[PDB]
Symmetry: C3
Subunit: 314 residues, 3 copies
Amino acid sequence: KPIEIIGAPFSKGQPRGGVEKGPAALRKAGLVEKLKETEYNVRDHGDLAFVDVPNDSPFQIVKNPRSVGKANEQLAAVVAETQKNGTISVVLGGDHSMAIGSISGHARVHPDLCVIWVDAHTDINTPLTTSSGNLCGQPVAFLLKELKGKFPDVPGFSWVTPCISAKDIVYIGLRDVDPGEHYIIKTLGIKYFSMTEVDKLGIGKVMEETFSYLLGRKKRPIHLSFDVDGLDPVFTPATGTPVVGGLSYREGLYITEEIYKTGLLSGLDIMEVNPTLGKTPEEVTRTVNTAVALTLSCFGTKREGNHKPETDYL
Amino acid sequence: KPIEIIGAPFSKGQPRGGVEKGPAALRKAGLVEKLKETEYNVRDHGDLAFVDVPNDSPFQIVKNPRSVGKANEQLAAVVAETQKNGTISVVLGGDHSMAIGSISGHARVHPDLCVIWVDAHTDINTPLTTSSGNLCGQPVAFLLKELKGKFPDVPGFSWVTPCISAKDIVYIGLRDVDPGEHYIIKTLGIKYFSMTEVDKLGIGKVMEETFSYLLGRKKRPIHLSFDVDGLDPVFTPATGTPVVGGLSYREGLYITEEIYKTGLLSGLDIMEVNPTLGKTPEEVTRTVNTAVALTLSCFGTKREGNHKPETDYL
Amino acid sequence: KPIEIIGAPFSKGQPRGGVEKGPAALRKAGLVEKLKETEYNVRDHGDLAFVDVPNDSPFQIVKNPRSVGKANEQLAAVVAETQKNGTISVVLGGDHSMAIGSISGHARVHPDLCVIWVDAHTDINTPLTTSSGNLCGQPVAFLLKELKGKFPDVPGFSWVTPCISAKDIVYIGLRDVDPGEHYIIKTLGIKYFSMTEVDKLGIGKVMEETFSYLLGRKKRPIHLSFDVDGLDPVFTPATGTPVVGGLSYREGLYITEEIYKTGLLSGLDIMEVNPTLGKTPEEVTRTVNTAVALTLSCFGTKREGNHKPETDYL
Ligand SMILES: NCCC[C@H](N)C(=O)O
Ligand SMILES: NCCC[C@H](N)C(=O)O
Ligand SMILES: NCCC[C@H](N)C(=O)O
Ligand SMILES: [Mn+2]
Ligand SMILES: [Mn+2]
Ligand SMILES: [Mn+2]
Ligand SMILES: [Mn+2]
Ligand SMILES: [Mn+2]
Ligand SMILES: [Mn+2]
């Protein structure tokens, strides 16, 4: 199945800039070229051009609502189209608010999809529970059916239609959840494996349970939304909201290796790589290389190694 | 149940100074204020003032015996009193010799208590087996009933009465045990999970077994004596005796989260944070923040998040 | 059973120099003296003197073939002799090409031996599959019976006779395997636990399975060939080919503790410690100390502690 890379250089979902440079940094490291060495056919859609909405005043506490809503409507259209042609979409972020468009467009073609969200955060604050008003911490709230009508309609998002139920998403890596968010995930009965569960079970058991929960009853497309801050700051330091005690480099690759093995990956997001936030050049290189490795892992690259079929190396 | 913070700025149990500054460093980081945000009622007893015993000559190889014995007698009295009023005592060290007074005072009110000792060391050397004579490496020897009469009475400790049996203590994190200490824990049949057992079982299984061993037969108060060097030097570098290959930050919090969940925590010690031993200011900040996080974890703070009851955040 | 330390200061198996200084660095850290504190009788054979073969032109792509082949023939002779006298050989590298001589000499006395290869690499490239021509990445190819006749006879190695079968070796730590190597290990059905398997199973289960696979049917001598780059660069940075996401310090010691417990260790290699590759003096000290700890672990040193028999420490 073909792969289509879609750059989403957008940072309006955040208070500070820099994450819009993520796609460029990833390409600079040769992500596209490296992906072409895998078993998949790769196509680069390029980077989307986003139109900044003039006089985009705050909707209550929410910041840049129209700009964020517009960027996501455009991304959703692009993703829906690539999905329609039967190709796996790979969105390079960009802040996590872009998951609204990515998942929305994906669901237009595969409404029965499930979501595996790797992040130190739930990103499920609503316009009413958010303390910052930053849309990068509210993606999931705009996507969940059970949250529909629980907050006022935000300018620029009227095109959004809640596509997934609280039962179709699984969080992995949680360790920085706001009171309101914790109330929401507990009240909605959302399935999650915070770092506490990862420590208890081991990443091996976490993936077994994640798959039995989401796929045990029926096999459906998987949308993996990977926020780089899900891994410990020691591995991915160049990111907006680093939180200590995260997933290790090994655990991140294990997650992606297992997702690859399911043969169900249909959509992927590689978010929050902010090249301007490295304390040193090396911290940026470290973060970019990790994001690249995770992406290649999603598409076949295994740590035990790989070799071409019908080729007698000896 | 109320919480009472007791500072024990004492370093005579060690050859070098600096650890007496631990309580100050912990408070500076806002430990007290942060604890007040938990579900517990918090009271700060302040820092105990210790009277240095004049001409405190060495008892054989043992150093500062009278000063250490006197400081611990005072701490035991203070702890016994807070325990008597039904409050959970939290001792901020200070070197680990202060566990003598902390546990002794605790046992005066809850004689059926059990001890979970998180440390890279057993701290079970007796005045006869010690190679250094430092009392910070001998706490447990003064507390165990089975060791009573196995060493000469040390000046300043005649007030001490062995309160716990070798069967009421569980070590977690061991990786730097002297020959004599190893002989003692094996000969006394003390239950332990050295790093070898943690690697084999995983911290999840270690806590299950620790609880079944200490609480399976009967539920009793838990005294958690946490030496910061139990965690790997990468997490808590500013400490007197760092040892490579320790518990991770995640594992330390898992331990404390599980202890919180038992609902049996009755006494706590946060020891060996020495602010003068950081190779850089950041290593000190790293160590203090970790100690603070572990303390908050013992009192309810969970990585999956927390929220106030009877509060509709939506 | 006696122990005999054999230094192999050789670096011709690699493109760059420096690893020949490994034995010196290890001794400088007091490896020999520390080993004498264990339960084993220790003898130091000293460092072998290798004769550089003049005009050692490349055999096709292979570099320094005659020099590498000659050094290994000499090492094999020395190892065979120590093995003959019933002593455990401990080879200090030196680049991993020296495993050819170490294992070859070992097999002359214990032809039924098995090999546990801890490395981030398989080092199984043949003179035809190698992209570099460096012999440090081809040791196993010269040792495997199934690879006999799969590549042209290399000058300087005519003395070598494939001694082990693909079924007598187990890899642990793999995470950087070339396409050709992956083709070879899959085609030959070699047993391995790449980092993916370690993440899935946990090091505890990995060792159980390694032993059931190699020893379940019959107990035989164990040859442990330990490449320091098997551990993550955070623990052993001063090495030629560091690869992120490796075994932890704890896991490395667990491996060695378990091998010690089998009572079957017959030959040991401590390879790839290159003192010239530390980014700082401390990174070198860190690498050397780790190699020393692993070696002592192989001979009895346990993290739970150790004490002398027939000695009443109390
Ligand atoms: N991704 C960071 C999220 C932080 C906080 N939950 C917020 O909603 O602002
Ligand atoms: N806490 C460090 C202890 C070191 C050694 N066991 C001693 O008793 O001096
Ligand atoms: N030990 C490093 C090996 C790297 C590569 N497999 C090679 O054969 O050159
Ligand atoms: Mn996040
Ligand atoms: Mn996120
Ligand atoms: Mn200690
Ligand atoms: Mn201690
Ligand atoms: Mn290697
Ligand atoms: Mn090697």
